């Protein structure tokens, strides 16, 4: 009867330019028909010029972003402060997500 998931609303949008990229998100956090916060950011700077958002279930998104930040930290530790390329980050995030394949993160992810 206990439901481990929730829906915090929100909407995010990423656009890729020629020499730039952009990642935006609304700062509204909701629950059902009530508003939890009018400024709860969900688009984060993760370092190495990588911005990340995991919109949907706020707990799962925050967990995923925390784990990705930690992966960036340990990547810098284990490979002589090598910058994490955007494709390497994408593959690492694929593995992070698929780890919980049978208990997913209720998040749509954009970096």
């Amino acid at each position: 009867q206990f439901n481990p998931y929730g829906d915090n609303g929100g909407t995010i949008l990423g656009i890729a330019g020629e020499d730039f990229a952009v990642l935006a998100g609304d700062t509204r956090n909701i629950t059902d028909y009530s508003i939890n916060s009018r400024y709860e950011p969900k688009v984060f700077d993760c370092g190495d010029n990588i911005v990340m958002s995991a919109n949907g279930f706020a707990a799962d998104g925050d967990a995923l972003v925390k784990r990705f930040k930690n992966s960036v930290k340990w990547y810098h530790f284990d490979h002589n402060d090598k910058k994490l390329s955007i494709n390497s980050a994408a593959r690492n995030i694929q593995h992070l997500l698929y780890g919980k394949r049978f208990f997913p993160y209720y998040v749509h992810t954009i970096i």
Binding site: K66, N70, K73, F77
Partner: protein
């Protein structure tokens, strides 16, 4: 004598000879010094190579944006201990949103090293560590021995010929403790300390390594050409 076959045996006088052999493994390692003021903390390490065709083995390891260490002795053991320290800082940040205090890091390293000195089959770590950090209580310099003893100091030195650097720091205390807000001057004091432990050798860009942390200064390592300014 007959009591050095493992860490689990006391000698008739009450000594643990395996721990002393680990300390000797330290004493043969390359020299490194650490010293801190009230705003910064600096590690100065003399790197050692195999021959003229080889590299100079790294001696400074970063543990977190506010804490790092330098090694003297068995490099794999230093890697293990620094990995454990990284994990402890990481856990502190993740669970409590809190930078790990350098003092608690020293306590954790002490308790980690102790368990290898009381149980059969294991062995003590064969490396000594100089830990610099900046936490909510300021700058900190620690010396760690594989016996488990960890000690906070204004400055110290470990490795071969470290006694010259240690005595120089004992004399320079009143001066270098007041080098606040000027990183390069504390770095110069550190290289002056490490010069006292030099025998038939001089500091070059290939064999000098430096690290610094402090207020508004993340733990950063200078190697190679970066240390040319301090020679």
């Amino acid at each position: 004598n007959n009591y050095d076959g493992d860490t689990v045996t006391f000698s008739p006088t009450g000594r643990l000879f395996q721990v002393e052999y680990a300390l000797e493994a330290i004493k043969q390692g390359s020299v490194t010094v650490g010293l801190r003021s009230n705003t910064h903390a600096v590690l100065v390490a003399l790197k050692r190579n195999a021959d003229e065709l080889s590299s100079y083995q790294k001696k400074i390891i970063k543990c977190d944006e506010h804490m790092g260490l330098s090694l003297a002795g068995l490099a794999p053991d230093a890697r293990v201990l620094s990995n454990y320290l990284r994990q402890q800082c990481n856990y502190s940040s993740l669970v409590f949103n809190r930078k790990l205090a350098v003092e608690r890091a020293g306590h954790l390293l002490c308790d980690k090293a102790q368990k290898n000195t009381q149980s059969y089959g294991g062995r003590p770590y064969g490396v000594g560590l100089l830990i610099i950090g900046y936490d909510k209580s300021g700058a900190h310099l620690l010396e760690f021995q594989p016996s488990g003893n960890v000690t906070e100091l204004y400055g110290t030195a470990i490795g071969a010929r470290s006694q010259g650097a240690k005595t120089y720091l004992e004399r320079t205390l009143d001066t270098f403790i007041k080098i606040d807000g000027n990183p390069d001057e504390l770095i110069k004091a550190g290289v002056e300390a490490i010069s006292q432990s030099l025998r038939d050798e001089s500091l070059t860009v290939d064999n000098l390594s430096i690290a610094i942390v402090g207020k508004d200064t993340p733990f950063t390592i200078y190697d190679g050409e970066a240390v040319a300014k301090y020679i």
